[PDB]
Amino acid sequence: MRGSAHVVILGAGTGGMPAAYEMKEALGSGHEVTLISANDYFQFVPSNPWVGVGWKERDDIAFPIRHYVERKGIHFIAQSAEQIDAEAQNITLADGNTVHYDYLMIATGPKLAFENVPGSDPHEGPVQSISTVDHAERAFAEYQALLREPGPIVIGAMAGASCFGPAYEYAMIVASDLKKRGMRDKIPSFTFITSEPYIGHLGIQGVGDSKGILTKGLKEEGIEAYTNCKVTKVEDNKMYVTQVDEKGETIKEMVLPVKFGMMIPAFKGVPAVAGVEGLCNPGGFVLVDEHQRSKKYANIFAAGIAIAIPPVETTPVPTGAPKTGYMIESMVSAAVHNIKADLEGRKGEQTMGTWNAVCFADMGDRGAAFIALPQLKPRKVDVFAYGRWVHLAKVAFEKYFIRKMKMGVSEPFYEKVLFKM
Amino acid sequence: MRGSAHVVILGAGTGGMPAAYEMKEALGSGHEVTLISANDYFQFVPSNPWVGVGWKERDDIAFPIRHYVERKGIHFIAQSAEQIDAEAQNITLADGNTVHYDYLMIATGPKLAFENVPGSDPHEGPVQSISTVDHAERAFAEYQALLREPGPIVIGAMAGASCFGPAYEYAMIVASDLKKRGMRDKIPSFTFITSEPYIGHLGIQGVGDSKGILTKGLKEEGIEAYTNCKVTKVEDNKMYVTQVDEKGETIKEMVLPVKFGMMIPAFKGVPAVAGVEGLCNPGGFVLVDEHQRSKKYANIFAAGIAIAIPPVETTPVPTGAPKTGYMIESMVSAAVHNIKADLEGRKGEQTMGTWNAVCFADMGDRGAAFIALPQLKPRKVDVFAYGRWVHLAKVAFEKYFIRKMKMGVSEPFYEKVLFKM
Ligand SMILES: Cc1cc2nc3c(=O)[nH]c(=O)nc-3n(C[C@H](O)[C@H](O)[C@H](O)COP(=O)(O)OP(=O)(O)OC[C@H]3O[C@@H](n4cnc5c(N)ncnc54)[C@H](O)[C@@H]3O)c2cc1C
Ligand SMILES: Cc1cc2nc3c(=O)[nH]c(=O)nc-3n(C[C@H](O)[C@H](O)[C@H](O)COP(=O)(O)OP(=O)(O)OC[C@H]3O[C@@H](n4cnc5c(N)ncnc54)[C@H](O)[C@@H]3O)c2cc1C
Ligand SMILES: CCCCCCCCCCCCO[C@@H]1O[C@H](CO)[C@@H](O[C@H]2O[C@H](CO)[C@@H](O)[C@H](O)[C@H]2O)[C@H](O)[C@H]1O
Ligand SMILES: CCCCCCCCCCCCO[C@@H]1O[C@H](CO)[C@@H](O[C@H]2O[C@H](CO)[C@@H](O)[C@H](O)[C@H]2O)[C@H](O)[C@H]1O
Ligand SMILES: CCCCCCCCCCC1=C(C)C(=O)C(OC)=C(OC)C1=O
Ligand SMILES: CCCCCCCCCCC1=C(C)C(=O)C(OC)=C(OC)C1=O
Ligand SMILES: [S]
Ligand SMILES: [S]
Ligand SMILES: [S]
Ligand SMILES: [S]
Ligand SMILES: [S]
Ligand SMILES: [S]
Ligand SMILES: [S]
Ligand SMILES: [S]
DSSP states (O other), X not given: XXXXXXXXXXXXXXXXXXXXXXXHHHHOTTSEEEEEXXXXXXXXXXXXXXXXXXXXXXXXXXXXXHHHHHTTTOEEEOOOEEEEEXXXXXXXXXXXXXXXXXXXXXOOOEEEOGGGSTTOSTTTSSEEOOSSHHHHHHHHHHHHHHHHSOOOEEEEEOTTOOOOHHHHHHHHHHHHHHHHTTOXXXXXXEEEEESSSSTTOTTTTOOTTHHHHHHHHHHHTTOEEEOXXXXXXXXXXXXXXXXXXXXXXXXXXXXXXXXXXXXXXXXXXXXXXXXXXXXXXXXXXXXXXXXXXBSSOTTEEEOGGGBOOOOSOOOSSOOOOOOOHHHXXXXXXXXXXXXXXXXXXXXXXXXXXXXXXXXXXXXXXXXXXXXXXXXXXXXXXXXXXXXXXXXXXXXXXXXXXXHHHHHOOOSOOXXXXXXXX | OTTSOEEEEEOOSTTHHHHHHHHHHHHOTTSEEEEEOSSSEEEOGGGHHHHHHTSSOHHHHEEEOHHHXXXXXXXXXXXXXXXXXXXXXXXXXXXXXXXXXXXXXXXXXXXXXXXXSTTOSTTTSSEEOOSSHHHHHHHHHHHHHHHHSOOOEEEEEOTTOXXXXXXXXXXXXXXXXXXXXXXXXXXXXXXXXXXXXXXXXXXXXXXXXXXXXXXXXXXXXXXXXXXXXXXXXXXXXXXXXXXXXXXXXXXXXXXXXXXXXXXXXXXXXXXXXXXXXXXXXXXXXXXXXXXXXXSXXXXXXXXXXXXXXXXXXXXXXXXXXXXXXXXXXXXXXXXXXXXXXXXXXXXXXXXXXXXXXXXEEEOSSOEEEEEXXXXXSSOSEEEEEXXXXXXXXXXXXXXXXXXXXXXXXXSOOOOXXXXXX
């Protein structure tokens, strides 16, 4: 309300949870902060591939949100938004209730666009998903069914995907788990299908020796790999794959039987956000300026996967660049600073900073990780790492992030860099 | 003097130059800051290998100090200290003049311990040095003489060395330059001799895949490599090498003719500092606490290569861990903070922080670099990088560091990390 702006945060994920705490900390008792999310629990997304192979359980990576934000004075609504009216500034919830806002911060993350590939929905066929704990559990269930009746395995990433790391991770740990169970030789064929122009392109034109190292890794595991692929449909338990050359000309089509499969889908914006007129590009990603403010509505901000970021390259099969944790947190930090500024007259000048990508993958005893910045080459940092220490770091960071999600963040979040001091 | 402490900084190198500026900035006009150094010019040490092969000239990497520190109000004495009397707090200069201090900050860097290996002094035989611009020029001169009369080449690192990167760098660019001149096939043999237990140990038990990558690099260049070596003497233009096994038992002795050679020597403390009773360990390195204060004299501090750092490992042939730029700067920063604190009653609690090692090497078009921390494994960061971007970064950092040495530093120095903001 006037003189006491009501700030709503839509989505309680990697960006959204921290945003709720930071907003409340920045605004204080004189303003209402409301967090709205489809689920009543927080999940640590990077741990889902492990749930998909059964190395982790839901309880390890998820927890109920309500008590933790409420003791901070944040209102929490565990309800999905179905409609956003940016004119009236009203949000319509799944139960038909309406919530008004003075500022809205959109952190709704990706819609998994299974519809791009008929038959690819995890509920429609053998191609599963590990992006959410709900999907990863279903993936693991189908993995167990594979163990009972071995058959061909197909893991990879669809056309338009932007999150390639976890597909590589998942293929590796599936291969690893199979060995452990003494079941690897029961597998007729193990295939990796990707929209990448080459192995380890990762939607970022490669980083360090990602190409060489991921190529050798897949080969060590007896995983046959195909690049420049798009899947046209999944039908009768078969994946119909089309492979192109540099000029997008078809050089072959394949039909792959699939007993167990997992393809990372293309990401779009969620329907309630995409549905807002003039808010989003055709992909449903919120068009924002460098201050995280929507270009159309001055009182709508966005952070996380939900925002639009222009491509810097074009691949033979469409692919996108990933939006990862540190950049998301910088986005969140900027949005909160600039909203608070608005509330106090001044114009916030804070930006998300330099584009970057960071990813950690754990194979069990050893991890792989990379850091790339900025987006276009030659970069200022372009590094790929592998080893037991990367694994230890993943474990440490997960423990830290989850604890922080329960304790609240102020916060200039990433000061876990004081491991220098 | 009383109420106006006189602070002296001994050594105008990587640690010393910044220390002079930071001291003056921290203390201001009420205190006298004096910089004393053997040479009247600053040199960018990491560029010396390039001077040693002739890819760079003295003028590119060195500049006269006086005008730059004096316009900051810093007194500059271009004279070597011969004696330090810590009781009377007097420094005796080469010309016999004496300089008194209330606080002394020692940044004298390494003494190149050629005496450990009879005949190894660059002025006594064919084994040259690239650690200083004076030595690197002499190295290049002998390189040109090699071109006139090709003969065997021997490059590497002595027993007790702690700075291995530049030996690898130098071997690589010598090989590279030879090719460019169409002279590589005129070389009878090209040998790399190191005290490391294995290739790419680098005195830090390896970092990332340094072992694999440096091994392959030397092999690509037709450079035959030997580890676990110590050189017992250089005589009649031959290098007498002893190789041991894991238990330090001799497994062979070699006699290597040398037309052109360069071995990184072991580092000790400079004589004037080592000469101070109770100041140093037997190596001549200043024993300091975590606040950079000498354990014996409360008004003597030290930073840079000059300080003693305990070994965390023991190799078959003695070797040491390197002391590199970022850690040196943290040392400097801490010493300055704690001296200023002393001057104002309080006890400074600032420390150098976590042990780390960082090194950049440029091969011409592409560079290699690493970061390791902390000292002992498993590390929190253990990364090796290679590529054109590393080269671009070396070029950039050198340009930046030199400009800063002319303009002065305040300063929380390394904020060239805002390439994130
Ligand atoms: C398998 C996988 C592995 C990954 N690994 C890494 C890694 O190692 N390192 C790294 O930096 N990044 C990693 N990421 C990338 C990234 O950081 C995550 O995807 C991250 O969770 C995205 O943050 P977000 O806040 O934008 O979206 P999300 O975390 O998905 O949060 C979005 C939230 O808003 C909600 N929501 C959606 N629609 C509505 C609605 N209509 N109404 C109400 N709520 C709604 C959601 O249910 C959810 O809680 C990974 C991503 C995936 C899928
Ligand atoms: C070949 C080589 C390559 C290197 N490359 C890297 C790299 O890529 N990255 C990195 O972080 N580090 C690198 N280093 C390591 C390191 O950072 C440097 O050695 C650095 O110059 C050390 O800083 P310092 O202030 O301790 O000693 P120095 O830089 O040697 O400065 C010491 C100074 O004090 C003086 N002095 C000595 N005795 C006296 C005396 N009795 N009286 C008066 N003055 C005296 C000197 O003449 C000199 O000016 C390299 C070192 C070498 C030798
Ligand atoms: C971050 C997301 C991106 C992808 C995530 C999942 C990808 C899977 C990674 C496959 C790598 C497997 O293969 C593994 O790679 C590295 C090669 O650098 C090798 O390891 C090599 O370099 C490392 C350091 O980085 C050294 O410690 C090691 O001694 C050396 O052999 C291993 O011998 C090999 O077994
Ligand atoms: C920092 C100080 C330590 C040592 C300094 C001097 C050491 C010399 C380095 C020798 C390396 C030469 O060999 C070179 O190594 C890397 C291997 O990772 C290869 O490069 C490989 O990884 C890089 C990324 O890191 C990719 O961009 C490249 O496409 C891939 O082939 C090169 O194909 C090879 O030519
Ligand atoms: C240039 C800055 C790089 C920061 C990286 C160092 C430590 C943090 C790891 C990155 C990371 C972040 C930020 C992160 O937010 C996140 O959760 C989604 C991860 O998944 C485990 C991450 O691996
Ligand atoms: C954990 C912190 C790592 C910092 C490294 C990023 C940028 C700086 C490069 C390191 C470096 C420093 C600090 C440095 O002081 C120095 O001069 C002696 C170099 O030689 C060229 C260096 O390469
Ligand atoms: S997925
Ligand atoms: S991703
Ligand atoms: S990724
Ligand atoms: S990722
Ligand atoms: S040297
Ligand atoms: S060094
Ligand atoms: S080094
Ligand atoms: S170095």
